[PDB]
Coordinates of C-alpha atoms and ligand atoms in Angstrom, one line a residue:
Chain A
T1 CA 229.7 73.6 120.0
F2 CA 226.0 74.1 120.4
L3 CA 223.1 71.9 119.4
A4 CA 219.8 73.7 119.1
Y5 CA 216.5 71.9 118.7
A6 CA 212.8 72.7 118.8
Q7 CA 210.3 71.0 121.1
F8 CA 206.8 70.5 119.9
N9 CA 203.9 69.9 122.3
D10 CA 200.7 68.4 120.7
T11 CA 198.9 67.7 124.0
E12 CA 195.8 69.7 123.1
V13 CA 195.8 69.1 119.3
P14 CA 192.7 67.1 118.2
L15 CA 193.3 63.8 116.7
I16 CA 192.3 62.9 113.1
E17 CA 191.5 59.2 112.8
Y18 CA 191.1 56.8 109.9
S19 CA 191.3 53.1 109.2
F20 CA 194.5 51.3 107.9
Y21 CA 193.6 47.8 106.6
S22 CA 197.1 46.7 106.1
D23 CA 197.9 43.3 104.8
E24 CA 195.0 40.9 104.0
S25 CA 196.0 38.6 106.8
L26 CA 195.3 41.4 109.4
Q27 CA 191.8 40.4 110.8
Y28 CA 190.9 43.8 112.3
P29 CA 191.6 47.2 110.7
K30 CA 194.0 49.3 112.9
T31 CA 193.1 52.9 113.5
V32 CA 195.7 55.5 112.7
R33 CA 195.7 58.5 115.1
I34 CA 197.5 61.7 114.4
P35 CA 197.5 64.9 116.3
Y36 CA 196.5 67.2 113.3
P37 CA 195.1 70.6 113.8
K38 CA 192.4 71.7 111.3
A39 CA 191.4 75.3 110.6
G40 CA 190.8 77.2 113.8
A41 CA 191.6 74.2 115.9
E42 CA 194.1 74.1 118.8
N43 CA 197.7 74.2 117.5
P44 CA 200.8 72.6 118.8
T45 CA 203.1 74.8 120.8
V46 CA 206.8 75.0 120.5
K47 CA 210.0 75.7 122.4
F48 CA 213.6 76.4 121.2
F49 CA 216.6 75.4 123.1
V50 CA 220.4 75.7 122.5
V51 CA 222.4 72.9 124.1
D52 CA 226.0 73.6 124.9
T53 CA 227.3 70.2 124.0
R54 CA 230.7 71.0 125.5
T55 CA 229.5 70.2 129.0
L56 CA 227.8 66.9 128.0
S57 CA 229.0 64.0 130.1
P58 CA 227.5 60.9 131.7
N59 CA 227.3 62.2 135.3
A60 CA 226.5 65.8 134.3
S61 CA 223.3 67.6 133.5
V62 CA 222.3 69.1 130.1
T63 CA 223.3 72.8 130.0
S64 CA 220.8 74.4 127.8
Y65 CA 219.1 77.8 127.3
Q66 CA 215.7 78.5 126.0
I67 CA 215.2 81.3 123.5
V68 CA 211.6 82.5 123.4
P69 CA 210.0 84.7 120.6
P70 CA 210.0 88.5 120.9
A71 CA 207.1 90.1 122.8
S72 CA 205.2 91.2 119.6
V73 CA 204.9 87.5 118.8
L74 CA 204.6 86.0 122.3
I75 CA 201.4 87.8 122.9
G76 CA 199.6 85.0 121.1
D77 CA 199.8 81.9 118.9
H78 CA 202.9 81.6 116.9
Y79 CA 205.1 79.3 114.8
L80 CA 208.9 79.0 114.8
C81 CA 209.6 79.0 111.1
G82 CA 213.3 79.4 110.6
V83 CA 216.5 78.7 112.2
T84 CA 219.8 79.9 110.8
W85 CA 223.3 79.7 112.4
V86 CA 225.2 82.9 111.8
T87 CA 228.3 82.2 113.9
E88 CA 229.2 79.9 116.9
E89 CA 227.8 82.7 119.0
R90 CA 225.1 84.1 116.9
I91 CA 221.9 82.5 115.8
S92 CA 219.0 83.8 114.0
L93 CA 215.4 82.7 114.8
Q94 CA 212.5 83.6 112.6
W95 CA 209.0 83.5 114.1
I96 CA 205.6 84.4 112.8
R97 CA 202.1 84.9 114.4
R98 CA 199.6 82.3 113.8
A99 CA 198.0 84.9 111.5
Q100 CA 201.1 84.8 109.2
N101 CA 201.0 88.4 108.1
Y102 CA 203.6 89.3 110.6
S103 CA 207.0 87.6 111.1
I104 CA 210.1 88.7 113.0
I105 CA 213.8 87.8 112.8
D106 CA 215.4 87.8 116.2
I107 CA 219.2 87.6 116.1
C108 CA 220.7 86.3 119.4
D109 CA 224.2 86.6 120.8
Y110 CA 225.9 84.2 123.2
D111 CA 227.0 85.6 126.5
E112 CA 230.3 83.9 127.5
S113 CA 229.8 84.9 131.1
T114 CA 226.3 83.6 131.6
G115 CA 225.8 81.0 128.9
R116 CA 222.6 82.5 127.7
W117 CA 221.5 83.7 124.3
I118 CA 220.6 87.4 124.5
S119 CA 218.2 89.3 122.3
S120 CA 217.7 93.0 121.5
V121 CA 215.4 95.3 119.6
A122 CA 218.4 96.4 117.6
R123 CA 218.7 93.0 116.1
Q124 CA 215.1 92.3 115.5
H125 CA 213.7 92.8 112.0
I126 CA 210.0 92.8 111.1
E127 CA 208.5 91.8 107.8
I128 CA 204.8 92.0 107.1
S129 CA 202.1 92.0 104.4
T130 CA 199.0 94.2 104.4
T131 CA 197.5 92.6 101.2
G132 CA 198.2 89.0 102.2
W133 CA 200.7 86.7 103.8
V134 CA 204.5 86.9 104.4
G135 CA 206.7 84.9 101.9
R136 CA 205.5 82.7 99.1
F137 CA 204.5 79.9 101.3
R138 CA 206.7 80.8 104.3
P139 CA 208.8 83.9 105.0
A140 CA 212.2 83.8 103.0
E141 CA 215.3 82.8 104.8
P142 CA 217.9 85.5 105.7
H143 CA 221.4 84.9 104.3
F144 CA 224.2 86.1 106.5
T145 CA 227.7 87.4 105.7
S146 CA 230.6 85.4 107.0
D147 CA 230.8 87.9 110.0
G148 CA 227.1 88.0 110.6
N149 CA 227.0 91.7 110.7
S150 CA 224.6 92.0 107.8
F151 CA 222.4 89.6 105.8
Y152 CA 220.6 89.3 102.5
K153 CA 217.0 88.3 102.2
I154 CA 214.0 88.3 99.9
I155 CA 210.9 90.5 100.7
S156 CA 208.3 92.3 98.6
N157 CA 209.3 95.8 97.5
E158 CA 207.2 98.9 97.3
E159 CA 206.0 97.6 93.9
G160 CA 204.9 94.2 95.3
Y161 CA 207.8 92.2 93.7
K162 CA 210.0 89.8 95.6
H163 CA 213.6 91.0 95.5
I164 CA 216.8 90.8 97.5
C165 CA 217.1 93.4 100.2
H166 CA 220.2 94.1 102.3
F167 CA 220.0 94.3 106.1
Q168 CA 222.4 95.6 108.6
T169 CA 222.2 93.0 111.4
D170 CA 221.6 95.8 114.0
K171 CA 219.7 98.4 111.9
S172 CA 216.1 98.3 110.8
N173 CA 216.4 99.8 107.3
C174 CA 217.3 97.7 104.3
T175 CA 218.4 98.3 100.8
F176 CA 217.2 96.6 97.7
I177 CA 220.0 95.2 95.5
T178 CA 217.5 93.9 92.9
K179 CA 214.4 95.4 91.3
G180 CA 212.1 95.0 88.4
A181 CA 208.8 93.3 87.2
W182 CA 210.1 89.8 87.9
Chain B
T1 CA 231.0 80.6 141.7
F2 CA 229.9 77.1 142.5
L3 CA 227.4 75.8 144.9
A4 CA 228.1 72.2 146.0
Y5 CA 225.3 70.2 147.7
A6 CA 224.4 66.7 148.6
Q7 CA 221.0 65.1 147.8
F8 CA 219.6 62.4 150.2
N9 CA 217.3 59.6 149.3
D10 CA 215.4 57.9 152.1
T11 CA 213.0 56.0 149.9
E12 CA 213.9 52.5 151.1
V13 CA 214.7 53.5 154.8
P14 CA 212.2 52.1 157.3
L15 CA 210.1 54.5 159.4
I16 CA 210.3 54.9 163.1
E17 CA 206.9 55.8 164.4
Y18 CA 206.1 57.2 167.8
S19 CA 203.3 59.3 169.4
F20 CA 203.4 63.0 170.0
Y21 CA 200.5 64.2 172.2
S22 CA 201.0 67.9 172.0
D23 CA 198.8 70.3 173.9
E24 CA 195.8 69.1 176.0
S25 CA 193.4 70.4 173.5
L26 CA 194.6 67.9 170.8
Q27 CA 191.9 65.3 170.8
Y28 CA 193.8 62.6 168.9
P29 CA 197.5 62.0 169.3
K30 CA 199.7 62.7 166.3
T31 CA 201.9 59.9 164.8
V32 CA 205.4 61.2 164.1
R33 CA 207.3 59.3 161.4
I34 CA 211.0 59.6 160.5
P35 CA 212.9 57.7 157.9
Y36 CA 215.3 56.2 160.5
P37 CA 217.8 53.5 159.7
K38 CA 218.4 51.1 162.5
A39 CA 221.3 48.6 162.6
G40 CA 221.7 46.6 159.5
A41 CA 218.8 48.3 157.8
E42 CA 218.6 49.9 154.4
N43 CA 220.4 53.2 154.7
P44 CA 219.6 56.3 152.7
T45 CA 221.6 56.9 149.5
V46 CA 223.6 60.0 148.6
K47 CA 224.6 62.0 145.6
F48 CA 227.0 64.9 145.5
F49 CA 226.7 67.9 143.2
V50 CA 228.6 71.0 142.1
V51 CA 226.5 73.7 140.5
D52 CA 227.9 76.4 138.3
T53 CA 225.8 79.4 139.4
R54 CA 227.1 81.6 136.6
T55 CA 224.6 80.2 134.1
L56 CA 221.7 80.6 136.5
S57 CA 218.8 82.2 134.6
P58 CA 214.9 81.6 134.6
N59 CA 215.1 80.3 131.0
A60 CA 218.1 78.1 131.5
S61 CA 218.7 74.7 132.8
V62 CA 220.9 74.0 135.7
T63 CA 224.5 73.3 135.1
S64 CA 225.7 70.6 137.5
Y65 CA 228.1 67.8 137.7
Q66 CA 227.7 64.8 140.0
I67 CA 230.9 63.8 141.7
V68 CA 230.8 60.1 142.4
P69 CA 233.1 58.5 145.0
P70 CA 236.2 56.6 144.0
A71 CA 235.3 53.0 142.9
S72 CA 236.8 51.4 146.0
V73 CA 234.0 53.1 147.8
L74 CA 231.3 53.2 145.0
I75 CA 231.5 49.3 145.3
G76 CA 229.0 49.3 148.1
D77 CA 227.0 51.2 150.7
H78 CA 228.8 54.4 151.6
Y79 CA 228.7 57.8 153.3
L80 CA 229.7 61.2 152.3
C81 CA 231.4 62.6 155.4
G82 CA 233.2 65.7 154.2
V83 CA 233.3 68.5 151.8
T84 CA 236.1 71.0 151.7
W85 CA 236.7 73.7 149.0
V86 CA 240.4 74.3 148.4
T87 CA 240.3 76.9 145.6
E88 CA 237.6 78.0 143.2
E89 CA 238.6 75.1 140.9
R90 CA 239.4 72.4 143.4
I91 CA 237.1 70.6 145.8
Ligands
LIG1 C1 215.5 57.4 145.2 O1 215.9 56.1 145.2 C2 214.9 55.2 144.7 C3 215.3 53.8 144.9 O2 215.3 53.5 146.3 C4 214.6 55.6 143.1 O3 213.6 54.8 142.6 C5 213.9 54.1 141.4 O4 213.6 55.0 140.3 C6 214.0 54.4 139.1 C7 213.9 55.4 138.0 O5 213.0 56.5 138.4 C8 213.2 53.1 138.8 O6 213.6 52.5 137.6 C9 213.3 52.1 140.0 O7 212.4 51.1 139.8 C10 213.1 52.8 141.4 N1 213.4 52.0 142.4 C11 212.5 51.7 143.4 C12 212.5 50.3 144.0 O8 211.7 52.5 143.8 C13 214.3 57.1 143.0 O9 214.4 57.4 141.6 C14 215.4 57.9 143.8 N2 215.0 59.3 143.7 C15 215.8 60.2 143.2 C16 215.2 61.5 142.7 O10 217.1 60.1 143.1
NAG2 C1 202.7 70.3 127.1 O1 201.5 71.1 127.2 C2 200.7 70.9 128.3 C3 199.5 71.8 128.3 O2 198.7 71.7 127.2 C4 201.5 71.0 129.6 O3 200.7 70.7 130.7 C5 202.7 70.1 129.6 O4 203.5 70.3 130.7 C6 203.5 70.4 128.3 N1 204.6 69.4 128.2 C7 205.9 69.7 128.2 C8 206.9 68.6 128.5 O5 206.3 70.9 128.0
NAG3 C1 229.5 58.1 136.4 O1 228.8 57.7 137.6 C2 228.6 56.2 137.5 C3 227.8 55.8 138.8 O2 226.9 56.8 139.2 C4 230.0 55.5 137.5 O3 229.8 54.2 137.2 C5 231.0 56.1 136.5 O4 232.3 55.8 136.7 C6 231.0 57.7 136.4 N1 231.6 58.2 135.4 C7 232.2 59.5 135.3 C8 231.7 60.4 134.2 O5 233.0 59.8 136.2
NAG4 C1 196.8 90.4 109.9 O1 195.5 89.7 109.9 C2 194.7 90.2 110.9 C3 193.4 89.4 111.0 O2 193.3 88.7 109.7 C4 194.4 91.7 110.8 O3 193.6 92.1 111.9 C5 195.7 92.4 110.7 O4 195.4 93.8 110.5 C6 196.6 91.9 109.6 N1 197.8 92.6 109.5 C7 197.9 93.4 108.5 C8 199.3 94.1 108.3 O5 197.1 93.7 107.6
NAG5 C1 212.7 84.1 129.4 O1 213.5 85.4 129.3 C2 212.8 86.3 128.4 C3 213.8 87.4 128.1 O2 213.9 87.6 126.7 C4 211.4 86.7 129.0 O3 210.8 87.6 128.1 C5 210.6 85.4 129.2 O4 209.4 85.8 129.8 C6 211.3 84.4 130.0 N1 210.6 83.2 130.2 C7 210.4 82.6 131.4 C8 209.3 83.3 132.3 O5 211.0 81.6 131.8

């Protein structure tokens, strides 16, 4: 029913440049240019939209809604790092501060009467690291139950081991279903 | 529920220009210009639209459908000369 996509804006991202000689017959090297942010540089920005492809038609406009990160993340540079569809009316977005020692999972519900995707502090779950970064490379993906009322996801436990915790979609405490020094 | 509206494009309509002198204190006269189509001239074009106000929200696009006229009319230059709502789901 819906098609979600992310928009990336690299307007202010510095360009890295290098020569590409190509085939011998090419008389002048071409210069490759890629918006590529290096450490501390200006980063691309992102936007997330949910298109309601049901309205799509030649002489009709695109009906879409923009889901923005939760305040705790909006305050500064962030990255959208995960998108998981829970149900036709529930989508989970996982953001993280440019710092990467703080991420949040925002679970949004579709409002049939207004067409927008609503968020709430009940459905927001924080994950962090005080000794490093979240996830092994990126924060782990949540895994929803078929009704999307709870989900399973990997996080570090009190002992510093990545195990499966169980989260109630609208409750902040989780329970570990695995444990051990592995 | 809905908010129908027409959009008018005068882009290719010539301009009638005349002087407006205004109050005595106005040192130079002001040139008034109106996109005014005189006989046989390029007329402004029109687009009709119905907007579903229910999905109106700052972080949301506008939901609107453009109602084009029947082909017998779409064929060439035309005018929209009437808009009558019958029911909430019929215009
Ligand atoms: C108003 O009408 C003009 C045409 O009179 C539109 O201008 C055209 O715009 C398209 C796409 O933007 C171009 O490919 C054409 O070359 C333009 N035509 C000319 C001769 O200007 C204009 O887009 C219309 N404005 C709106 C918002 O509907
Ligand atoms: C991209 O970002 C620039 C600011 O860096 C802004 O002016 C521009 O409108 C943005 N483009 C879009 C289409 O969002
Ligand atoms: C869409 O509008 C164009 C002209 O603006 C017309 O050729 C076509 O028949 C219309 N189709 C629909 C969706 O009614
Ligand atoms: C995340 O990193 C920033 C700067 O590196 C630091 O100020 C902040 O305390 C860190 N968060 C945690 C939980 O340590
Ligand atoms: C979009 O709505 C959200 C509500 O979650 C709000 O926090 C955000 O500032 C809005 N963005 C704008 C100004 O379009």
